[PDB]
Amino acid sequence: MAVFGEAAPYLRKSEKERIEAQNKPFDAKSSVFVVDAKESFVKATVQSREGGKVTAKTEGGATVTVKDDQVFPMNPPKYDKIEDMAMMTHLHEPAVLYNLKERYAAWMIYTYSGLFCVTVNPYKWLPVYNAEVVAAYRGKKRQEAPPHIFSISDNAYQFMLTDRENQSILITGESGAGKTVNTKRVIQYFATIALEDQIISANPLLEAFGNAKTVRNDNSSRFGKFIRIHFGTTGKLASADIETYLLEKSRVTFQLKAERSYHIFYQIMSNKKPDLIEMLLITTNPYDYAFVSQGEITVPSIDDQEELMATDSAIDILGFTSDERVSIYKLTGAVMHYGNMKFKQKQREEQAEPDGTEVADKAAYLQNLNSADLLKALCYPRVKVGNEYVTKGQTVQQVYNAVGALAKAVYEKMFLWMVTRINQQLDTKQPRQYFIGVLDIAGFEIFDFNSLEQLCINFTNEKLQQFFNHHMFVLEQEEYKKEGIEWEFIDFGMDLAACIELIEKPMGIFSILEEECMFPKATDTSFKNKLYEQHLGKSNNFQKPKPAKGKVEAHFSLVHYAGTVDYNIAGWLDKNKDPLNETVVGLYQKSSMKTLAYLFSKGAKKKGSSFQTVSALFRENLNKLMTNLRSTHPHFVRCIIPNETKTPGAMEHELVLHQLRCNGVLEGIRICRKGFPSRILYADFKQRYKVLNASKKASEKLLGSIDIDHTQYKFGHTKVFFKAGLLGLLEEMRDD
Numbered sequence: 001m002a003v004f005g006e007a008a009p010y011l012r013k014s015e016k017e018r019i020e021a022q023n024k025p026f027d028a029k030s031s032v033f034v035v036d037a038k039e040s041f042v043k044a045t046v047q048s049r050e051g052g053k054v055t056a057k058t059e060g061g062a063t064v065t066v067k068d069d070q071v072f073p074m075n076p077p078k079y080d081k082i083e084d085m086a087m088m089t090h091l092h093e094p095a096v097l098y099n100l101k102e103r104y105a106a107w108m109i110y111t112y113s114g115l116f117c118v119t120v121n122p123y124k125w126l127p128v129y130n131a132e133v134v135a136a137y138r139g140k141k142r143q144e145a146p147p148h149i150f151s152i153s154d155n156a157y158q159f160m161l162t163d164r165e166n167q168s169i170l171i172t173g174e175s176g177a178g179k180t181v182n183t184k185r186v187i188q189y190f191a192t193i194a195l196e197d198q199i200i201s202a203n204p205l206l207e208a209f210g211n212a213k214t215v216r217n218d219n220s221s222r223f224g225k226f227i228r229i230h231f232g233t234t235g236k237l238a239s240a241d242i243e244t245y246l247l248e249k250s251r252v253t254f255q256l257k258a259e260r261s262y263h264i265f266y267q268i269m270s271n272k273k274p275d276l277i278e279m280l281l282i283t284t285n286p287y288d289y290a291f292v293s294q295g296e297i298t299v300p301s302i303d304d305q306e307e308l309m310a311t312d313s314a315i316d317i318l319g320f321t322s323d324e325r326v327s328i329y330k331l332t333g334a335v336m337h338y339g340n341m342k343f344k345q346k347q348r349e350e351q352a353e354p355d356g357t358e359v360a361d362k363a364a365y366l367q368n369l370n371s372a373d374l375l376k377a378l379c380y381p382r383v384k385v386g387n388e389y390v391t392k393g394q395t396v397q398q399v400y401n402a403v404g405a406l407a408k409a410v411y412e413k414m415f416l417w418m419v420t421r422i423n424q425q426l427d428t429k430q431p432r433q434y435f436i437g438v439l440d441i442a443g444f445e446i447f448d449f450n451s452l453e454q455l456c457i458n459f460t461n462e463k464l465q466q467f468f469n470h471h472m473f474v475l476e477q478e479e480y481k482k483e484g485i486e487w488e489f490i491d492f493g494m495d496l497a498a499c500i501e502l503i504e505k506p507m508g509i510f511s512i513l514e515e516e517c518m519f520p521k522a523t524d525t526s527f528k529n530k531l532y533e534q535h536l537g538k539s540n541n542f543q544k545p546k547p548a549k550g551k552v553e554a555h556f557s558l559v560h561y562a563g564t565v566d567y568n569i570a571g572w573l574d575k576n577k578d579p580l581n582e583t584v585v586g587l588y589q590k591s592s593m594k595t596l597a598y599l600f601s602k603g604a605k606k607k608g609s610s611f612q613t614v615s616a617l618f619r620e621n622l623n624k625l626m627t628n629l630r631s632t633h634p635h636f637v638r639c640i641i642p643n644e645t646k647t648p649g650a651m652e653h654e655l656v657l658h659q660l661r662c663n664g665v666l667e668g669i670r671i672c673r674k675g676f677p678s679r680i681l682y683a684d685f686k687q688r689y690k691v692l693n694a695s696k697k698a699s700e701k702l703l704g705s706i707d708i709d710h711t712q713y714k715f716g717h718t719k720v721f722f723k724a725g726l727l728g729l730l731e732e733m734r735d736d
Contacts, residue, residue: 004136004145010107010126012146013081024077028732033072033094034058040653041094044071075099076731083147084112087680089727091673093657096666101651104642110148114672115472116665117152117637121178123646129185134192152635153186157193159633160434161235166632168437170468172663173639175219182639183227183438190229190436194237199227202242202422205314208263208307209415210247215258215447218301222248222262223415224625226439230432238430242423244416245441245625246460248453249614250575252335252411253291253404256451261292263304264332269297272305279326280333281362291339291407319425327593330366331414337363338407343379343396352379352396368592377583378402383609398579405578405612410588413598437632444560444662448551450567452575456618458560459503463626465561465664466496471634472668484716488675495671499541499560507534510615517577517613524570528555531569562661579610638663676713676721685720688734706730 001014008014034044034056044066045057053065075090075098082088085099096113103111104120109128111118128148137150139158145151156167169186173179180203188196210223224245232238251261260266268276269286277284286297315325340359343352354360354375364371379399382391394402444461447454470493480486503509512530516522535542535556545554545566554566588599607616640659642651660666682695686702693705699715708730714721 005130005132007128007130007133011110011128011148012108013106018081021080022078026074026076026078026731028073028728031074032056033074034062034066035070036653040657041072041097042653043074043094043098046071073725073728076728078731081106081108084114084143086114086669086672087678089678089722089724089731091669091677091724093660093666096660096669097653097657100656101642101653104651105649107649108146110146110151112143112147113665114476114668115468115636116663116668117147117149117635118640118665119149119182119637120640120642120651123648134189138193149182149186149637150189152637153189154193156436156633156635157190157235160231160436164233164434166434166437168439168629168632168634169637170464170634171438171440171637171639172443173440174443174641174659175217175221177639177641179440179637179639182637183440187227187229187438191237194231194235195240198240198426201314201317202426203314204307205311205318205418205422206244208267208311208314209418210244210262212251212255212262213259213296213299213301215256215449216445218299220442221440222251222442224439224441226437226625228435228437230435232430233433236430238428238432239435240423240426240428241435242419242426244419246456246618246621247412247415249408249412249578249617250453252408253339254575255295256449257295260295260297260299263307265289265292265336266297267304267308267311268329268332268336270304270308272308276329276333280329280336281366282333282336289336289339291336319421324421324594327595328414328418330593331410331595334363334366335407335411337366338403341375341403343399345396350393350395352394352399354379367588367595369587369590374584374587377587378581381581381583383582401574401577401579402581402584405580406584408578409580410595410598417598437629437634439629443659444562444664446562446565450565452572452614455503455509455558455567456615458558458562458565459500460622461562461662461664462496462500462503462560463622465667466493466500467626467630468634468636469493469496469667469671472672476672480716483718483721485714485721487714487721492671496561499558502535502539502541502558504619509535510619513572513576513615514613517573518611522573524573527573528569531556561664561667576614578612578614580612582609638665673724675723677724678722678727679719680722681719689730691734691736706734 002008029048030046032044032046033041036042042058044062046054048054052067054071055063056066056071057063072092072094073090075088075095079088080099081103082099085091085096088095088099100111100118100120103109107122107126109120109122109126129150133148133150137145137148137154140151140154142151142155153169156169159165160167171179171182173182184196184200187199206223207219207221211219211221214220224247226243226245228239228241228243229237230239230241255261266286268280268282269284271277271284282289287293312325337359341363342355342359344355345351346353357371357375360375361371364374379394380391381394382389441460441464442457445454445457470491473492477486477488477492501508505511509531512534513527516527516530536544541559543557543559545557547554553568553570555569557564557566585599589596589601638659640656642656644652644655682699686698689702689706693702696717699720703715703720708726712723712726
């Protein structure tokens with residue numbers, strides 16, 4: 001029992017509760033669940049099986065008739081509070097729902113789910129991470145001590161110590177959901193078991209540059225985050241590294257009405273220091289600058305003034321000179337200025353031309369290069385043809401797309417290089433080796449009105465889901481080679497492939513979108529018709545939107561591992577085209593500041609400066625991830641938010657139901673539940689099955705005598721393998 005220390009009661013209960021819950025009367029004729037009007041699933045109490053009719057009593061005593069397919073048999077109390085739910089004789093939505101609801105009630109936060117380390121959050125100081133569980137969880141294997149994040153961290157540590165292999169921790173928590181704390185927890189755990197201060201110190205400037213509020217939350221971290229903590233050849237902290245991945249681009253010049261651009265803009269708009277406001281030549285009203293003024297400017301949660309000097313100090317403590325910081329500020333100001341550059345068609349042509357060089361002068365001075373030259377090289381580029389140059393023509397719309405891509409590219413380059421500098425200041429020069437992977441990412445965030453970025457995020461999560469699906473497949477399945485029997489002989493990732501191919505293959509959604517962003521006179525309606533005629537009916541994941549619910553418009557319905565979702569197509573075309581000019585990039589290369597430090601200066605498979613598109617860069621760096629990550633052993637953590645407010649213990653279903661799909665842990669449990677989830681020894685088997693027929697041959701006797709078929713199970717040579725829904729049949733009969 002108390003084999004580790006004192007943290008047990010809020011971590012795990014002792015025997016007395018285990019046995020007081022084990023031996024409890026569990027009927028299987030009224031223990032069924034129910035679908036709810038207010039919630040999803042509560043524990044119901046029916047009279048009997050009246051066909052598709054019941055009087056299902058809730059805790060408030062409900063009576064309504066409910067069909068069979070949504071009243072669910074409850075897991076027994078002998079299976080109550082089990083850590084690894086992948087063995088329960090009932091594997092469904094309510095199974096896991098209450099298997100963690102009652103555990104959060106009993107405060108057993110840290111649970112297991114196959115490979116998933118499901119971890120709820122508290123709202124009160126619980127001493128589960130104290131200086132004794134660090135040694136209690138030290139040296140352990142996975143499944144003997146009670147679950148915890150320290151368990152999996154030490155697991156990955158000893159794993160890399162076994163075969164010099166890189167490992168990775170895949171965490172998924174909402175903005176400000178507590179994962180921002182669990183990351184520092186695991187990194188300091190590793191720092192002891194081998195720094196976190198530098199990590200948290202560099203942290204806020206990141207969210208300054210690349211975070212914003214959305215229609216859902218307030219400090220959404222749009223980019224991806226990945227931390228490489230390398231060790232010596234024996235295990236010794238010899239690195240502190242950081243990776244930014246799939247940083248969103250289109251924010252810098254476009255955002256829907258219910259959100260805004262990144263923080264830094266409005267931060268400078270906040271006038272805690274008019275030194276910048278004068279120096280960056282900007283005014284204070286953000287509605288004066290179109291790139292940032294298409295949504296909600298002021299947020300009623302935090303002001304941006306204090307954040308100015310907060311992130312300023314964040315810069316200062318890191319390896320940044322002062323000129324470096326004035327350069328960052330000037331570049332952000334020029335990004336803001338580009339929006340107001342105006343162009344007008346010439347009267348005798350479609351060639352664009354400038355009207356007022358004022359904002360042109362401002363932006364050009366802000367980079368120390370001529371203004372007339374800048375606007376010329378925007379509205380009169382020239383491309384290298386053969387062994388000379390010709391000056392292409394430009395229409396107004398083309399010039400607007402060009403300057404948009406310009407601002408986007410310079411901003412993302414600023415981001416990537418400041419990250420470079422950060423990871424440049426934080427390294428320790430010890431010769432290092434195989435690292436660990438700490439990676440957060442935006443979850444499967446589906447909304448009431450989807451768009452491009454939502455689809456890209458959902459696609460990233462599709463790739464991740466298939467990744468870990470296949471990993472769990474190989475591990476779990478190919479374990480049982482030694483178990484004298486195999487089952488579910490197909491790969492497990494090969495069912496997300498149907499939804500992936502619909503997005504990434506030739507003639508896929510992304511390919512078609514590229515086609516239309518390249519076609520001469522494409523329009524939104526042509527895009528829709530092309531999508532339909534290429535996919536509708538000729539696939540299954542793709543299907544028609546359903547008009548209802550008074551929502552504005554959906555245009556095509558995709559199905560994922562996290563359920564179906566239908567997207568809105570308006571604006572996808574002009575949001576995706578970003579023709580990067582070249583003469584102006586030369587201008588940048590020949591500037592006088594470290595703006596050119598970004599833009600420092602085969603032909604096959606590389607598109608041209610007029611075929612560039614956002615989705616392509618996505619699909620490129622996404623595969624960069626999904627290969628270097630594939631070169632590293634994974635582990636998974638899930639910071640849930642069980643309640644709207646901070647009332648601990650309580651947990652409403654509908655909200656945790658959503659996180660159950662965003663992380664898609666039910667997908668793992670369902671791919672592991674369509675076979676033999678129950679692998680068990682003789683320990684409980686003989687003692688609870690000898691009651692009907694009062695080792696191996698003894699198992700054969702104690703199984704054949706209790707009226708079970710030899711189809712839905714197999715005891716290979718060591719453990720018996722069982723479906724979930726069969727032990728319940730035994731549960732009530734193995735007790736008599």
